[PDB]
Amino acid sequence: MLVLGLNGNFSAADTDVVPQLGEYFFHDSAASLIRDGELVAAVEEERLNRIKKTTKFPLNAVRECLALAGARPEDVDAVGYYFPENHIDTVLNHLYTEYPRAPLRYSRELIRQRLKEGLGWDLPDEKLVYVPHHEAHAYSSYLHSGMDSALVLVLDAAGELHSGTVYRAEGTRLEKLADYPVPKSLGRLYLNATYLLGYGFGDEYKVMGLAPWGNPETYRDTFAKLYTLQDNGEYELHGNIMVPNLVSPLFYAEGFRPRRKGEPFTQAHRDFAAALQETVEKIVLHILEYWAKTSGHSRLCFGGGVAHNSSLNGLILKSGLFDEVFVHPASHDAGAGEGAAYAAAASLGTLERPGKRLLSASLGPALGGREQIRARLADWAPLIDVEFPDDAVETAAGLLAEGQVLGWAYGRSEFGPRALGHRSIVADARPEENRTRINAMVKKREGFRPFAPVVTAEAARDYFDLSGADGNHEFMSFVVPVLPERRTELGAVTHVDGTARVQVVSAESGERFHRLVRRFGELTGTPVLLNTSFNNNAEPIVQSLDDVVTSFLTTDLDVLVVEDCLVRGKASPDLGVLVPRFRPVTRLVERRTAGPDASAGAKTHEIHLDYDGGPSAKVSPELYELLGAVDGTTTLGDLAKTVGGLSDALATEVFALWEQRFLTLAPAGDIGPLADDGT
Amino acid sequence: MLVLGLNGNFSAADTDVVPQLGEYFFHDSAASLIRDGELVAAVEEERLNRIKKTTKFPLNAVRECLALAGARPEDVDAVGYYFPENHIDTVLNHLYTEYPRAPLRYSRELIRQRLKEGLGWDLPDEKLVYVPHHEAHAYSSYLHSGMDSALVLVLDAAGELHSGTVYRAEGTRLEKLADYPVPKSLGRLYLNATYLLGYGFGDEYKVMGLAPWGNPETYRDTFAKLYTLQDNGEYELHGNIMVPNLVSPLFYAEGFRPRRKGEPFTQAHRDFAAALQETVEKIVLHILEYWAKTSGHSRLCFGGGVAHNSSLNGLILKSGLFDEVFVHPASHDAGAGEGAAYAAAASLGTLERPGKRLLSASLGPALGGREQIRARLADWAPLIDVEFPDDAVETAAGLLAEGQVLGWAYGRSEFGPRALGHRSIVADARPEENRTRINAMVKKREGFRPFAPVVTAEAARDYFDLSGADGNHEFMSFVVPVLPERRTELGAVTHVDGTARVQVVSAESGERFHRLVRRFGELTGTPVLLNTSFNNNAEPIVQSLDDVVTSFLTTDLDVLVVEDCLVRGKASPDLGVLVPRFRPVTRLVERRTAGPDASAGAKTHEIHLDYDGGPSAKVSPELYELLGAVDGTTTLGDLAKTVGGLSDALATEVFALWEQRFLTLAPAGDIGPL
Ligand SMILES: NC(=O)OP(=O)(O)OC[C@H]1O[C@@H](n2cnc3c(N)ncnc32)[C@H](O)[C@@H]1O
Ligand SMILES: NC(=O)OP(=O)(O)OC[C@H]1O[C@@H](n2cnc3c(N)ncnc32)[C@H](O)[C@@H]1O
Ligand SMILES: [Cl-]
Ligand SMILES: [Fe+3]
Ligand SMILES: [Fe+3]
């Protein structure tokens, strides 16, 4: 029983179905593959087209999943899509009325066209199954829990009918107990508020990170005017007719000032985050207190995008409402993509389910075999120095004990937003200094952002308070207090309220990463490391060896450990050997605007990425002339010859474009097809 | 007592308050000036910045109104703005949360900044008055009616609180009788439906013109699912939670396929428009049947943007529900700007009002004095031939009788969307082939579109069925039946259903235009002309002399009559003497996207206008190089020398960009102050 689960919109690599298609129109595209009831492969398209939370059709994700499964497209028994057909087609139809030049192609025709043109795959109509959105979420969260029965709660921003749903799950059977309508979305509430802080879609985790720095008393009475808790676990959100934002009109009327780009976070801003987080917590605990008592159940699965609020999950864990709580690594729409595969199989006979609780999210493409990796690392010679230690974990453990910050790339990439030791950046977890050192310098993000610890299963309870229930910690789903007697010891991974988004690694969840942290513990007396995602501020988590090396070379990391090779950056790297390549969304433009006196203004030049929210950057006339000749094969050095050579000024200008990922820059050729490692 | 009325957003000429500010965020910007109760000047900003239904701050309109009144900024006693302060600021606040780079400037600071930087006018806080939106519509529509008591209905997309409001008016006082919430908007319903016919904001009256070609029965039962009439003049619209469009999900579920831009209008499209138009008529007449008998009024003023639905007005006229009906020429938000002035005046003293029913919309800037018009037409000599007939009206009537299609430009431009004899295109109303060609060749628009007649007041009842109530026909507010025995004769202006959006012109409403129509009637026996607005498909109604000549030369008009000068295009027009200028929104781009094997794709060049909805067009490599050197003073002939002479292909390529208004082309100099 081999079933593809699909989520996201339908745009091609280089264009969107409607020009500048909204980034909120079916985001976090992904593909999942199940076989005989198990999740055999899953990867978000963002890892492959390098567009954070992309909406584009997950064609690459499908190709990669089929390769990991050793399947042809025609081997696939069914395809599940994470919304009902009439709902997606109604939304598409609405986009088409707003863009009258777009041809009338609805989801079924588009899915078949993308697979046909992309994979030579001729999908028969009977193999495509469309699925209720909250059902998809519920299957994904509950079926990987290892539980045989559970209360299931789903809370997200937009199901077709509901923003919230409560189920009773038993075996492979879901029974809806309650629902909440779309305008009551707590995910929409959170996003609406997030905009008042100078942030936008995808920044919710930043707002959650900020909230402990604020006082929830300041705006508590203001938020009280936006919701009311009611009997039987009901609530209302109080809308308005003025703007599509629940929160902005009232806060404007009380003098709140939305944060501007590049501005600092005032105490008003910090307190707003704190009150927003406490609001969503109170409503969800209101829901769960009622449905715990009413259903009688002791086990909870929590899905939907809202279940990436690990602070909320920590409060659910400590509430004492449940004995067990499970949360999936990909609880946002990529998880509904997986769930849709299971719902498609259920629609076509009895449902085969996973045999055990999910412990590892290592499910995307691997980096490649040792032969092809070495070969490719050699293409990078003009830029890096490679060692081959005897025990790369031992060497890495010592280097971390020495105080270095490591890139750590091994095996199959993580499904969902957290890095868990397959595409990670790791450092010593004890010195506070590592916080501003990694935030400001190497990862280039805001300072209030705390860092997440990874600890061995054996030492977990010597450092963290996991009480209140038995939650799953392999995926950093839960924020838990750090025990007071360990707070100062864990100076880098302890938030202001003494809490931490802990990963608990085991020989089961990740043998190599468990070995690393254990071995570090023996060397140091503290088996806890800092673990943050391996990417800079302009890209999602790195996927390929090339992505890994590129990201190493464009951040200030000390050493990179990638499949037992120890990589360092040469003294002066020769950028001239790299071959520049446009991304599918790269645009290069010379512009003239209207001058005063109604002349043609003077030429300016820019590069940008053509998707909604895509970045943009000025380029010098000289780099514009160089980039216009990019052919995909000639090296940067050789292209620069046409403008007098790759001078230090040009190389610096190119490097800064590289850091923002406007172009692909890598040695000639590729690493070739990913080899059969025999697993 | 001198009061300025304002409406629109606050964007400058070249930038918008937020980048790509949506075209619906405070559109139809305009300024109005009232002195001693009388509307002395009014013009929409679109006529001056040449962006249809523009949202930009009406800076040029304010300056032009002050000049027409002979007033200085410091003379203005008050300024009214057509929405409450908190409402417009809440919307601005929302846009700022979506665009965190934009600084937190709200409407009071923005309005005073635009006036100070734009006019040198430091406006004190106490002179700025914000006004309820439907109250502003109501004042405008009622105070110009000539009536001393009336029922006043306002229907539009949305005021700050309501989609519709019903008032009692007596003397100068408005008292509210009823209101309808924002989700019940009939304006929003009609605009939602308009999006299904491949159209957008501003196109509603095209859908209106399509409706008589459709059968209203096909989708009647479908539309019946989106509204319910209730007792005592109430009604409800049934929304949905999938998409922000009331209409599209239901019609999708029944297999409706929204027309694509540049595809024909199928019979299902036509039937869709006909059922839509019937639906809104049913609901409005339901509202008005209740409130006429309840309020006791025999007279009705109807305003708000929905009052530009001339078909609806004609059914209100024939309904027998009222003895009299008045509709203002500018019932959309420009008219709300004017009403904001009256409300501002009322809050700062007693309220002076118009002495008479408004008969003329000729309220914008004029074309200029006779000598500056003659001198400026001389500057255009390399492209035009000019005659100076003894009696231009006499000559024009004869040319019309010989089958010529005339541009007609005189005096002050029309306020509101209809051309009424000051910026008009006119032709013989009799041959049906005139509608076919003027649609295809001159206005360059869809063949289904009807044409509106102008008739003399003395012959109106010989041709049209005006009966029922007494409505005002000076501004083409009402669709009326053409008399059956005249439908054959009026081949070009009788719509498929036998109706016509008539302008009845009189010596009092437009003396010169009336003389033209009367004289044409004397020559031919038919005192009726076709009268369409003087603009091509790429511009709003022409304003200045250079606008009129530009439009004449880039439309396929036979002859232009402008302030008694007879203008025709030269056999070979020398485009090289024209000085190209960028418009403030013109952008010139050389672009590369990704190509094969992740290469840089091949260069392309394009020109575009930088506003939401703005057009774009490809340009050749060599025109791109030419336009890159535009300095605003050098002629196109001199500019083309750098690229090796003004080729015949370059001139042709330039002419087509001129026709689409991507740049300004005009002889050196200008007409000077008017
Ligand atoms: N159907 C659909 O909309 O996709 P989805 O399941 O991925 O839900 C995303 C929603 O979860 C909310 N959300 C996401 N992350 C969140 C976080 N860390 N904290 C609070 N809310 C969050 C987010 O604001 C957004 O409203
Ligand atoms: N409300 C506001 O902000 O400005 P406003 O007074 O100018 O109203 C615009 C509204 O009039 C509606 N509208 C315009 N023309 C229309 C027509 N011919 N038929 C129906 N509705 C029309 C249009 O669809 C739109 O919903
Ligand atoms: Cl591994
Ligand atoms: Fe979801
Ligand atoms: Fe209005």
Residue numbers in the entry:
A (entry chain B): 1 to 679
B (entry chain A): 1 to 674
What does the paper say about this structure?
Carbamoyltransferases (CTases) catalyze carbamoylation, an important modification for the bioactivity of many secondary metabolites with pharmaceutical applications. GdmN and Asm21 contribute to O-carbamoylation at the C7 (S configuration) of geldanamycin and ansamitocins, respectively. CTases in class III, which modify secondary metabolites, adopt two nucleophilic half-reactions, the formation of carbamoyl-AMP derived from ATP, CP, and Mg2+ and the subsequent transfer of the carbamoyl group from carbamoyl-AMP to the secondary metabolites. GdmN forms a face-to-face homodimer through unusual C-terminal domains, a previously unknown functional form for CTases.
The structure of 4 was determined by NMR spectroscopy and HR-ESI-MS and confirmed by X-ray crystallographic analysis, demonstrating that this mutant could catalyze 7-O carbamoylation and 3-O carbamoylation successively. The major difference occurred at the substrate-binding pocket. As we had hypothesized, G188R and V24Y reshaped the substrate-binding pocket, refining the shape complementarity of the binding pocket to the substrates. Due to the G157A change, the carbonyl oxygen atom of the carbamoyl group could not be accommodated by the conventional oxyanion hole composed of the backbone amides of A158 and A157, leading to a rotation of the carbamoyl group of carbamoyl-AMP. Additional b-factor putty views indicated that P19-F25 of loop 1, D156-H162 of loop 2, and N240-P244 of loop 4′ in the iterative mutant are highly mobile compared to those in wild-type GdmN. Such flexible loops resulted in more possibility for 3 binding. Our study also further unveiled the recognition mechanism for iterative activity, revealing that the hydrogen-bonding interaction donated by G188R and more flexibility of the loops resulted from V24Y, G157A, and R158A, contributes collaboratively to the regioselectivity modulation.
